């Protein structure tokens, strides 16, 4: 939609927003597993 | 773009390789077995 813009990886990770990317072979993938927890411990990962 | 390789990888998902260390293999090239002679003089031809 907005080819002229660019992600904000550090700001996104600090703001707990999962981001899409382009993996191998060129298919889009989901490349983050962060939840809505603000505390920086084991709880902000998705699988725990 | 793609195929690019980063080096820092700070607090964000991704892969990165550090620049080659090559610090424990530091040699020194002086070529001690070489001798040259320098002198002044008066000659017939040459730039003074």
């Amino acid at each position: 939609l907005y080819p002229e813009d660019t992600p904000d990886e550090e700001a996104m990770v600090k703001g707990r927003l999962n981001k899409v990317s382009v993996g191998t072979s060129g298919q889009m993938i989901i490349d983050d597993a962060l939840t809505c927890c603000t505390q920086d411990n084991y709880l902000h990962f998705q699988h725990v | 773009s793609q195929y690019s390789i980063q080096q820092s990888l700070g607090n964000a998902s991704g892969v990165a390789v550090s620049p080659i260390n090559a610090d424990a293999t530091l040699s020194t090239g002086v070529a001690l077995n070489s001798s040259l002679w320098a002198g002044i003089g008066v000659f017939a031809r040459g730039k003074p």
Side-chain angles (χ1 to χ4, degrees):
Chain A
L1 249 201
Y2 303 138
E4 51 285 29
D5 264 323
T6 168
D8 300 353
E9 262 57 46
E10 267 322 294
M12 260 187 182
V13 157
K14 197 162 63 44
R16 310 290 164 180
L17 214 166
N18 304 49
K19 64 213 181 53
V20 289
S21 98
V22 182
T24 40
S25 321
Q27 290 48 18
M28 301 264 260
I29 68 149
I30 319 195
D31 221 330
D32 218 358
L34 300 166
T35 79
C36 261
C37 185
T38 87
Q39 269 290 83
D40 206 285
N41 45 15
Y42 285 1
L43 267 188
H44 66 67
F45 297 99
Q46 175 53 46
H47 68 264
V48 160
Chain B
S1 100
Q2 213 187 344
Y3 302 75
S4 158
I5 318 287
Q6 32 178 322
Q7 308 166 5
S8 270
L9 172 143
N11 205 11
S13 70
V15 72
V17 312
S18 210
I20 318 191
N21 176 258
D23 225 356
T25 176
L26 182 121
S27 169
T28 316
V30 197
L32 274 172
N33 63 30
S34 205
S35 56
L36 306 175
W37 59 272
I40 72 197
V42 202
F43 304 78
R45 187 194 299 168
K47 204 202 178 312

Coordinates of all heavy atoms in Angstrom, one line a residue:
Chain A
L1 N 0.8 -1.2 0.0 CA 0.0 0.0 0.0 C 0.9 1.3 0.0 O 0.5 2.2 -0.7 CB -0.9 0.0 1.2 CG -2.4 -0.2 0.9 CD1 -3.2 0.3 2.1 CD2 -2.8 0.5 -0.4
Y2 N 1.9 1.3 0.8 CA 2.8 2.4 0.9 C 4.2 2.0 0.6 O 5.1 1.8 1.5 CB 2.7 3.0 2.3 CG 1.3 3.4 2.7 CD1 0.8 3.2 4.0 CD2 0.5 4.1 1.8 CE1 -0.5 3.5 4.3 CE2 -0.8 4.5 2.2 CZ -1.2 4.2 3.4 OH -2.5 4.6 3.8
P3 N 4.6 1.8 -0.7 CA 6.0 1.4 -1.0 C 7.0 2.4 -0.6 O 8.2 2.0 -0.4 CB 5.9 1.2 -2.5 CG 4.7 2.0 -3.0 CD 3.7 1.9 -1.9
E4 N 6.7 3.7 -0.4 CA 7.7 4.7 -0.1 C 8.0 4.7 1.4 O 9.0 5.4 1.7 CB 7.2 6.1 -0.5 CG 5.8 6.5 0.0 CD 4.6 5.9 -0.8 OE1 4.8 4.7 -1.3 OE2 3.6 6.5 -0.9
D5 N 7.3 4.1 2.2 CA 7.6 4.1 3.7 C 8.5 2.9 4.0 O 8.8 2.0 3.2 CB 6.3 4.1 4.5 CG 5.9 5.5 4.9 OD1 6.8 6.3 5.2 OD2 4.7 5.8 4.9
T6 N 8.8 2.8 5.3 CA 9.7 1.8 5.8 C 9.3 1.5 7.3 O 8.9 2.4 8.0 CB 11.2 2.2 5.7 OG1 12.0 1.2 6.5 CG2 11.4 3.6 6.3
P7 N 9.5 0.2 7.7 CA 9.2 -0.1 9.1 C 10.1 0.6 10.1 O 11.1 1.2 9.7 CB 9.4 -1.7 9.1 CG 9.5 -2.1 7.7 CD 9.6 -1.0 6.8
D8 N 9.8 0.4 11.3 CA 10.4 1.1 12.4 C 10.9 0.1 13.5 O 10.5 0.2 14.7 CB 9.5 2.2 13.1 CG 9.1 3.3 12.1 OD1 9.7 3.3 11.0 OD2 8.3 4.1 12.5
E9 N 11.6 -1.0 13.1 CA 11.8 -2.2 13.8 C 11.9 -2.0 15.3 O 11.2 -2.6 16.1 CB 13.0 -2.9 13.3 CG 12.7 -4.0 12.3 CD 11.9 -3.6 11.1 OE1 12.2 -2.5 10.5 OE2 10.9 -4.3 10.8
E10 N 12.8 -1.1 15.7 CA 13.0 -0.9 17.2 C 11.8 -0.3 17.8 O 11.4 -0.8 18.9 CB 14.2 0.1 17.4 CG 15.5 -0.7 17.6 CD 15.3 -1.9 18.4 OE1 15.0 -1.8 19.6 OE2 15.5 -3.0 17.8
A11 N 11.2 0.7 17.2 CA 9.9 1.3 17.8 C 8.8 0.3 17.8 O 8.0 0.2 18.8 CB 9.5 2.5 17.0
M12 N 8.7 -0.6 16.8 CA 7.7 -1.6 16.7 C 7.9 -2.6 17.9 O 6.9 -3.0 18.5 CB 7.7 -2.3 15.4 CG 6.6 -1.8 14.4 SD 6.6 -2.8 12.9 CE 5.3 -1.9 12.0
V13 N 9.1 -3.0 18.1 CA 9.4 -4.0 19.1 C 9.1 -3.4 20.5 O 8.5 -4.1 21.4 CB 10.8 -4.6 19.0 CG1 11.2 -5.1 20.4 CG2 10.8 -5.7 18.0
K14 N 9.4 -2.1 20.7 CA 9.2 -1.5 22.0 C 7.7 -1.3 22.2 O 7.2 -1.3 23.3 CB 9.9 -0.2 22.1 CG 10.0 0.4 23.5 CD 11.0 1.4 23.6 CE 10.7 2.6 22.8 NZ 9.3 3.0 22.8
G15 N 6.9 -1.1 21.1 CA 5.5 -0.9 21.2 C 4.7 -2.2 21.0 O 3.4 -2.1 21.0
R16 N 5.3 -3.3 21.0 CA 4.6 -4.6 20.9 C 3.7 -4.7 19.7 O 2.4 -4.8 19.9 CB 3.9 -4.9 22.2 CG 4.7 -4.6 23.5 CD 5.7 -5.7 23.6 NE 6.7 -5.3 24.6 CZ 7.8 -6.0 24.9 NH1 8.0 -7.2 24.4 NH2 8.7 -5.6 25.8
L17 N 4.3 -4.7 18.5 CA 3.5 -4.8 17.3 C 4.2 -5.8 16.4 O 5.4 -5.5 16.0 CB 3.4 -3.4 16.6 CG 2.1 -3.1 15.8 CD1 2.0 -1.7 15.5 CD2 2.1 -3.9 14.6
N18 N 3.6 -6.9 16.1 CA 4.2 -7.9 15.2 C 4.2 -7.4 13.8 O 3.3 -6.7 13.4 CB 3.5 -9.2 15.3 CG 3.4 -9.8 16.7 OD1 3.1 -9.0 17.6 ND2 3.8 -11.0 16.9
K19 N 5.3 -7.7 13.1 CA 5.5 -7.1 11.7 C 5.7 -8.3 10.7 O 6.2 -9.3 11.0 CB 6.8 -6.3 11.7 CG 8.0 -7.0 12.0 CD 9.0 -6.1 12.7 CE 10.3 -6.9 13.0 NZ 10.9 -7.5 11.7
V20 N 5.2 -8.0 9.5 CA 5.4 -8.9 8.4 C 6.7 -8.6 7.7 O 7.3 -7.6 7.9 CB 4.2 -8.8 7.4 CG1 3.0 -9.4 8.0 CG2 4.0 -7.4 7.0
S21 N 7.2 -9.6 6.9 CA 8.4 -9.5 6.2 C 8.3 -10.3 4.9 O 7.3 -10.9 4.6 CB 9.6 -9.8 7.0 OG 10.0 -11.2 6.8
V22 N 9.5 -10.5 4.3 CA 9.6 -11.3 3.1 C 10.7 -12.4 3.4 O 11.9 -12.0 3.5 CB 10.0 -10.6 1.8 CG1 10.0 -11.5 0.6 CG2 8.9 -9.5 1.6
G23 N 10.3 -13.6 3.7 CA 11.2 -14.7 4.0 C 11.9 -15.2 2.7 O 11.8 -14.6 1.7
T24 N 12.4 -16.4 2.9 CA 13.0 -17.1 1.7 C 12.0 -17.5 0.7 O 10.8 -17.7 1.0 CB 13.8 -18.3 2.2 OG1 13.1 -19.0 3.2 CG2 15.2 -17.9 2.7
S25 N 12.4 -17.5 -0.6 CA 11.6 -17.9 -1.7 C 10.6 -16.9 -2.1 O 9.9 -17.0 -3.1 CB 10.8 -19.3 -1.4 OG 11.7 -20.2 -0.7
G26 N 10.5 -15.8 -1.3 CA 9.7 -14.6 -1.7 C 8.3 -14.6 -1.2 O 7.6 -13.7 -1.6
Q27 N 7.8 -15.5 -0.4 CA 6.5 -15.5 0.2 C 6.5 -14.7 1.5 O 7.4 -14.9 2.3 CB 5.9 -16.9 0.4 CG 5.5 -17.7 -0.8 CD 6.6 -17.8 -1.9 OE1 7.8 -17.5 -1.6 NE2 6.2 -18.2 -3.1
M28 N 5.5 -13.8 1.6 CA 5.4 -13.1 2.9 C 5.2 -14.0 4.1 O 4.4 -15.0 4.0 CB 4.3 -12.0 2.8 CG 4.4 -11.1 1.6 SD 5.2 -9.5 2.2 CE 3.7 -8.5 2.3
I29 N 5.8 -13.6 5.2 CA 5.6 -14.4 6.4 C 5.4 -13.5 7.6 O 5.7 -12.3 7.5 CB 6.8 -15.3 6.7 CG1 8.1 -14.5 7.0 CG2 7.1 -16.2 5.5 CD1 9.0 -15.2 8.0
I30 N 4.9 -14.0 8.7 CA 4.9 -13.3 10.0 C 6.2 -13.6 10.7 O 6.6 -14.7 10.8 CB 3.7 -13.8 10.8 CG1 2.5 -13.9 10.0 CG2 3.5 -12.8 11.9 CD1 1.2 -14.0 10.8
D31 N 6.9 -12.5 11.1 CA 8.2 -12.6 11.7 C 8.4 -12.1 13.0 O 9.4 -11.4 13.4 CB 9.3 -12.0 10.7 CG 10.5 -12.8 10.6 OD1 10.9 -13.5 11.6 OD2 11.2 -12.8 9.5
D32 N 7.4 -12.2 13.9 CA 7.5 -11.8 15.3 C 6.4 -12.5 16.1 O 5.3 -12.9 15.6 CB 7.3 -10.3 15.4 CG 8.3 -9.7 16.4 OD1 9.0 -10.5 17.1 OD2 8.3 -8.5 16.6
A33 N 6.7 -12.7 17.4 CA 5.8 -13.4 18.3 C 5.7 -12.7 19.6 O 5.8 -13.3 20.7 CB 6.3 -14.9 18.5
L34 N 5.4 -11.4 19.6 CA 5.4 -10.6 20.8 C 3.9 -10.3 21.1 O 3.1 -10.1 20.3 CB 6.1 -9.2 20.6 CG 7.6 -9.4 20.2 CD1 8.1 -8.0 19.7 CD2 8.3 -9.8 21.5
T35 N 3.6 -10.4 22.4 CA 2.3 -10.2 23.0 C 2.1 -8.8 23.4 O 2.9 -7.9 23.1 CB 2.1 -11.2 24.2 OG1 2.7 -10.6 25.3 CG2 2.6 -12.5 23.9
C36 N 1.1 -8.5 24.1 CA 0.8 -7.1 24.6 C 1.3 -6.8 25.9 O 1.1 -5.7 26.4 CB -0.8 -6.9 24.6 SG -1.4 -6.0 23.1
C37 N 2.1 -7.7 26.6 CA 2.7 -7.4 27.9 C 3.7 -6.4 27.7 O 4.5 -6.4 26.8 CB 3.2 -8.7 28.5 SG 3.9 -8.5 30.1
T38 N 3.7 -5.4 28.6 CA 4.7 -4.4 28.6 C 6.0 -4.7 29.4 O 7.1 -4.2 29.1 CB 4.2 -3.1 29.2 OG1 4.3 -3.0 30.6 CG2 2.7 -3.0 28.8
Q39 N 5.9 -5.5 30.4 CA 7.0 -5.9 31.3 C 8.0 -6.7 30.4 O 7.6 -7.5 29.6 CB 6.6 -6.7 32.5 CG 6.3 -5.8 33.7 CD 7.5 -5.2 34.3 OE1 8.0 -4.2 33.8 NE2 8.1 -5.8 35.3
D40 N 9.3 -6.4 30.6 CA 10.4 -7.1 29.9 C 10.8 -8.3 30.7 O 11.8 -8.3 31.4 CB 11.5 -6.1 29.6 CG 12.3 -6.5 28.4 OD1 13.1 -7.5 28.4 OD2 12.1 -5.8 27.3
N41 N 10.1 -9.4 30.5 CA 10.4 -10.7 31.1 C 10.0 -11.8 30.1 O 9.8 -11.5 29.0 CB 9.8 -10.8 32.5 CG 8.3 -10.4 32.5 OD1 7.7 -10.3 31.4 ND2 7.7 -10.3 33.6
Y42 N 10.0 -13.0 30.6 CA 9.6 -14.1 29.7 C 8.2 -14.1 29.2 O 7.9 -14.8 28.3 CB 9.9 -15.5 30.4 CG 11.3 -15.9 30.6 CD1 12.3 -15.1 30.1 CD2 11.7 -17.1 31.2 CE1 13.7 -15.4 30.2 CE2 13.0 -17.4 31.3 CZ 14.0 -16.6 30.8 OH 15.3 -17.0 30.9
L43 N 7.4 -13.2 29.8 CA 5.9 -13.2 29.5 C 5.6 -12.6 28.2 O 4.5 -12.8 27.7 CB 5.2 -12.6 30.7 CG 4.7 -13.6 31.7 CD1 3.7 -12.9 32.7 CD2 4.0 -14.8 31.1
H44 N 6.5 -11.7 27.7 CA 6.1 -11.0 26.4 C 6.2 -11.8 25.2 O 5.7 -11.4 24.1 CB 6.8 -9.7 26.3 CG 8.3 -9.8 26.1 ND1 8.8 -10.3 25.0 CD2 9.3 -9.4 26.9 CE1 10.1 -10.3 25.0 NE2 10.5 -9.8 26.2
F45 N 6.9 -13.0 25.3 CA 6.9 -13.9 24.1 C 5.6 -14.6 24.0 O 4.8 -14.6 24.9 CB 8.1 -14.9 24.3 CG 9.4 -14.3 24.3 CD1 10.1 -14.1 25.4 CD2 10.0 -13.9 23.1 CE1 11.3 -13.5 25.4 CE2 11.3 -13.4 23.1 CZ 11.9 -13.1 24.2
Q46 N 5.3 -15.1 22.8 CA 4.0 -15.6 22.6 C 3.8 -17.1 23.1 O 2.7 -17.4 23.7 CB 3.7 -15.6 21.1 CG 2.3 -16.3 20.7 CD 1.2 -15.7 21.5 OE1 1.1 -14.5 21.6 NE2 0.3 -16.5 22.0
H47 N 4.8 -17.9 23.0 CA 4.5 -19.3 23.3 C 4.4 -19.6 24.8 O 3.7 -20.5 25.3 CB 5.6 -20.2 22.7 CG 7.0 -20.0 23.3 ND1 7.9 -19.2 22.8 CD2 7.5 -20.6 24.4 CE1 9.0 -19.2 23.5 NE2 8.8 -20.0 24.5
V48 N 5.1 -18.8 25.7 CA 5.1 -19.0 27.1 C 3.8 -18.9 27.7 O 3.3 -19.8 28.4 CB 6.2 -18.2 27.8 CG1 5.9 -18.0 29.3 CG2 7.6 -18.7 27.6
Chain B
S1 N 18.4 -3.9 0.6 CA 17.5 -4.8 0.0 C 17.6 -6.2 0.5 O 17.9 -6.4 1.6 CB 17.7 -4.8 -1.6 OG 18.4 -5.9 -1.9
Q2 N 17.2 -7.1 -0.4 CA 17.4 -8.5 0.0 C 18.8 -9.0 -0.2 O 19.6 -8.3 -0.8 CB 16.4 -9.4 -0.8 CG 15.9 -10.6 -0.1 CD 15.1 -11.6 -1.0 OE1 14.7 -11.2 -2.0 NE2 14.9 -12.8 -0.5
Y3 N 19.1 -10.2 0.3 CA 20.4 -10.8 0.2 C 21.5 -10.0 1.0 O 22.6 -10.4 1.0 CB 20.9 -10.9 -1.3 CG 20.0 -11.8 -2.1 CD1 18.8 -11.3 -2.6 CD2 20.4 -13.0 -2.6 CE1 18.0 -12.0 -3.4 CE2 19.6 -13.8 -3.4 CZ 18.4 -13.3 -3.8 OH 17.5 -14.0 -4.6
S4 N 21.1 -8.9 1.5 CA 22.0 -8.1 2.3 C 22.2 -8.7 3.7 O 21.4 -9.5 4.2 CB 21.5 -6.6 2.5 OG 22.1 -6.0 3.6
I5 N 23.4 -8.4 4.3 CA 23.8 -9.0 5.5 C 24.1 -7.9 6.5 O 25.0 -7.0 6.2 CB 25.0 -9.9 5.4 CG1 24.9 -10.8 4.2 CG2 25.2 -10.8 6.6 CD1 23.9 -11.9 4.3
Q6 N 23.4 -7.9 7.6 CA 23.7 -6.9 8.7 C 24.7 -7.4 9.6 O 25.2 -8.5 9.5 CB 22.4 -6.5 9.4 CG 21.4 -7.6 9.5 CD 20.2 -7.2 10.3 OE1 20.3 -6.4 11.3 NE2 19.0 -7.6 9.9
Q7 N 25.2 -6.5 10.6 CA 26.2 -6.9 11.5 C 25.9 -6.6 13.0 O 26.5 -7.2 13.8 CB 27.5 -6.1 11.2 CG 27.9 -6.3 9.7 CD 29.0 -5.3 9.3 OE1 29.5 -4.5 10.1 NE2 29.3 -5.3 8.0
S8 N 24.9 -5.8 13.3 CA 24.6 -5.4 14.7 C 23.6 -6.3 15.3 O 23.9 -7.0 16.3 CB 24.2 -3.9 14.7 OG 25.3 -3.1 14.9
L9 N 22.4 -6.4 14.8 CA 21.3 -7.2 15.3 C 21.0 -6.9 16.7 O 21.3 -7.6 17.7 CB 21.6 -8.7 15.0 CG 20.8 -9.8 15.6 CD1 20.8 -10.9 14.5 CD2 21.4 -10.4 16.8
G10 N 20.5 -5.7 16.9 CA 20.2 -5.2 18.3 C 18.7 -5.2 18.6 O 17.9 -4.4 18.1
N11 N 18.2 -6.1 19.4 CA 16.9 -6.1 20.0 C 15.8 -6.2 18.9 O 14.8 -5.6 19.0 CB 16.6 -4.9 20.9 CG 15.5 -5.2 21.9 OD1 15.1 -6.3 22.1 ND2 15.1 -4.1 22.6
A12 N 16.1 -7.0 17.8 CA 15.1 -7.2 16.8 C 15.4 -8.5 16.1 O 16.5 -9.0 16.0 CB 15.2 -6.1 15.7
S13 N 14.3 -9.2 15.6 CA 14.5 -10.5 15.0 C 15.3 -10.3 13.7 O 15.1 -9.3 13.0 CB 13.1 -11.1 14.7 OG 12.5 -10.3 13.6
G14 N 16.1 -11.3 13.4 CA 17.0 -11.3 12.2 C 18.2 -12.1 12.4 O 18.4 -12.8 13.5
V15 N 19.0 -12.1 11.4 CA 20.3 -12.8 11.4 C 21.4 -11.9 11.0 O 21.2 -11.0 10.2 CB 20.3 -14.1 10.6 CG1 20.3 -13.7 9.1 CG2 21.4 -15.0 10.9
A16 N 22.6 -12.1 11.6 CA 23.7 -11.2 11.3 C 25.0 -11.9 11.6 O 25.1 -12.7 12.5 CB 23.6 -9.9 12.1
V17 N 26.0 -11.6 10.8 CA 27.4 -12.2 10.9 C 28.3 -11.0 11.2 O 28.2 -10.0 10.6 CB 27.8 -13.0 9.7 CG1 26.7 -14.0 9.3 CG2 28.2 -12.1 8.6
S18 N 29.2 -11.2 12.2 CA 30.2 -10.2 12.6 C 31.3 -10.2 11.6 O 31.6 -11.2 10.9 CB 30.7 -10.4 14.0 OG 31.0 -9.2 14.6
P19 N 32.0 -9.0 11.4 CA 33.1 -9.0 10.5 C 34.3 -9.8 11.1 O 34.4 -10.0 12.3 CB 33.5 -7.5 10.5 CG 32.9 -6.9 11.8 CD 31.6 -7.7 11.9
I20 N 35.1 -10.4 10.1 CA 36.1 -11.3 10.5 C 37.0 -10.7 11.5 O 37.5 -9.6 11.3 CB 36.8 -11.8 9.2 CG1 35.8 -12.0 8.1 CG2 37.6 -13.1 9.5 CD1 36.4 -12.8 6.9
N21 N 37.4 -11.5 12.5 CA 38.2 -11.0 13.6 C 39.7 -10.8 13.2 O 40.2 -9.7 13.1 CB 38.1 -11.9 14.8 CG 39.0 -11.4 16.0 OD1 40.0 -12.0 16.2 ND2 38.6 -10.4 16.7
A22 N 40.3 -12.0 12.9 CA 41.7 -12.0 12.3 C 42.6 -11.1 13.1 O 43.4 -10.4 12.6 CB 41.7 -11.6 10.9
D23 N 42.6 -11.2 14.5 CA 43.5 -10.5 15.3 C 44.5 -11.3 16.0 O 45.5 -10.8 16.5 CB 42.7 -9.7 16.4 CG 43.2 -8.3 16.5 OD1 44.2 -7.9 15.9 OD2 42.6 -7.5 17.3
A24 N 44.3 -12.6 16.1 CA 45.3 -13.6 16.7 C 46.3 -14.1 15.7 O 47.1 -14.9 16.0 CB 44.5 -14.7 17.4
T25 N 46.2 -13.6 14.4 CA 47.1 -14.0 13.4 C 47.8 -12.9 12.8 O 48.2 -12.9 11.6 CB 46.2 -14.7 12.3 OG1 47.1 -15.1 11.2 CG2 45.2 -13.8 11.8
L26 N 48.1 -11.9 13.6 CA 48.8 -10.7 13.1 C 50.3 -11.0 13.0 O 51.0 -11.2 14.0 CB 48.6 -9.5 14.1 CG 49.2 -8.2 13.6 CD1 48.2 -7.1 13.4 CD2 50.3 -7.8 14.6
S27 N 50.8 -10.9 11.7 CA 52.2 -11.0 11.4 C 52.8 -9.7 11.2 O 52.2 -8.6 11.5 CB 52.4 -11.9 10.2 OG 53.8 -11.9 9.8
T28 N 54.1 -9.6 10.8 CA 54.8 -8.4 10.5 C 55.7 -8.6 9.3 O 56.6 -9.5 9.4 CB 55.6 -7.9 11.7 OG1 54.7 -8.0 12.9 CG2 55.9 -6.4 11.5
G29 N 55.6 -7.8 8.3 CA 56.4 -8.0 7.1 C 57.5 -6.9 7.1 O 57.1 -5.7 6.7
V30 N 58.7 -7.2 7.4 CA 59.8 -6.2 7.4 C 60.9 -6.6 6.4 O 61.6 -5.7 5.9 CB 60.4 -6.0 8.8 CG1 61.2 -4.7 8.9 CG2 59.3 -6.0 9.8
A31 N 61.0 -7.9 6.2 CA 62.0 -8.4 5.2 C 63.4 -8.0 5.7 O 64.1 -7.2 5.0 CB 61.7 -8.0 3.8
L32 N 63.8 -8.5 6.8 CA 65.1 -8.2 7.4 C 66.2 -8.5 6.5 O 67.3 -7.8 6.6 CB 65.2 -8.8 8.8 CG 64.6 -8.1 9.9 CD1 64.6 -8.9 11.2 CD2 65.3 -6.8 10.1
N33 N 66.1 -9.5 5.7 CA 67.3 -9.9 4.9 C 67.4 -9.1 3.6 O 67.6 -9.7 2.5 CB 67.2 -11.4 4.6 CG 65.9 -11.8 3.8 OD1 65.4 -11.0 3.0 ND2 65.4 -13.0 4.0
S34 N 67.3 -7.8 3.7 CA 67.5 -6.9 2.6 C 68.3 -5.7 3.0 O 68.1 -5.1 4.0 CB 66.1 -6.4 2.1 OG 66.1 -6.1 0.7
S35 N 69.3 -5.3 2.1 CA 70.2 -4.3 2.4 C 70.4 -3.4 1.2 O 70.6 -3.9 0.1 CB 71.5 -4.8 2.9 OG 72.1 -5.7 1.9
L36 N 70.3 -2.1 1.4 CA 70.5 -1.1 0.4 C 71.5 0.0 0.9 O 71.5 0.2 2.1 CB 69.2 -0.4 -0.1 CG 68.1 -1.4 -0.6 CD1 66.9 -0.6 -0.9 CD2 68.6 -2.2 -1.8
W37 N 72.2 0.6 0.0 CA 73.3 1.6 0.3 C 72.9 2.9 -0.2 O 72.5 3.1 -1.3 CB 74.6 1.1 -0.2 CG 74.6 1.0 -1.7 CD1 74.3 -0.2 -2.4 CD2 75.0 2.0 -2.6 NE1 74.5 0.1 -3.7 CE2 74.9 1.4 -3.9 CE3 75.4 3.3 -2.5 CZ2 75.2 2.1 -5.1 CZ3 75.7 4.0 -3.7 CH2 75.6 3.4 -4.9
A38 N 73.1 4.0 0.6 CA 72.8 5.3 0.2 C 74.1 6.2 0.4 O 74.8 6.1 1.3 CB 71.7 5.9 1.1
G39 N 74.3 7.0 -0.6 CA 75.5 7.8 -0.6 C 75.4 9.1 -1.4 O 74.5 9.2 -2.3
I40 N 76.3 10.1 -1.1 CA 76.4 11.3 -1.9 C 77.6 11.3 -2.7 O 78.5 10.5 -2.5 CB 76.3 12.5 -1.0 CG1 77.7 12.7 -0.2 CG2 75.2 12.4 0.0 CD1 77.6 13.6 0.9
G41 N 77.7 12.1 -3.7 CA 78.8 12.1 -4.6 C 78.7 13.2 -5.6 O 77.8 14.0 -5.7
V42 N 79.8 13.3 -6.5 CA 79.9 14.2 -7.6 C 80.0 13.4 -8.8 O 81.0 12.6 -8.9 CB 81.1 15.2 -7.4 CG1 80.8 16.4 -8.3 CG2 81.3 15.5 -6.0
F43 N 79.1 13.6 -9.8 CA 79.2 12.8 -11.0 C 79.1 13.6 -12.2 O 79.2 14.8 -12.2 CB 78.0 11.8 -11.0 CG 78.0 10.9 -9.7 CD1 77.5 11.3 -8.5 CD2 78.4 9.6 -9.8 CE1 77.5 10.5 -7.4 CE2 78.4 8.8 -8.7 CZ 77.9 9.2 -7.5
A44 N 78.9 13.0 -13.4 CA 78.8 13.7 -14.7 C 77.3 14.0 -15.1 O 77.1 15.1 -15.6 CB 79.5 12.9 -15.8
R45 N 76.4 13.0 -14.9 CA 75.0 13.2 -15.3 C 74.1 12.8 -14.2 O 74.4 11.8 -13.5 CB 74.7 12.4 -16.6 CG 73.4 12.6 -17.2 CD 73.0 11.6 -18.2 NE 73.9 11.6 -19.3 CZ 74.0 10.6 -20.2 NH1 73.2 9.5 -20.2 NH2 74.9 10.7 -21.2
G46 N 73.0 13.5 -14.0 CA 72.0 13.2 -13.0 C 71.4 14.5 -12.5 O 71.9 15.6 -12.7
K47 N 70.2 14.4 -11.9 CA 69.5 15.5 -11.4 C 70.1 15.9 -10.1 O 70.1 15.1 -9.1 CB 68.0 15.2 -11.3 CG 67.1 16.4 -11.3 CD 65.8 16.1 -10.6 CE 64.9 17.3 -10.6 NZ 65.6 18.6 -10.2
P48 N 70.5 17.2 -9.9 CA 71.2 17.6 -8.7 C 70.2 17.7 -7.5 O 69.1 18.1 -7.7 CB 71.8 18.9 -9.1 CG 70.9 19.5 -10.1 CD 70.5 18.3 -10.9

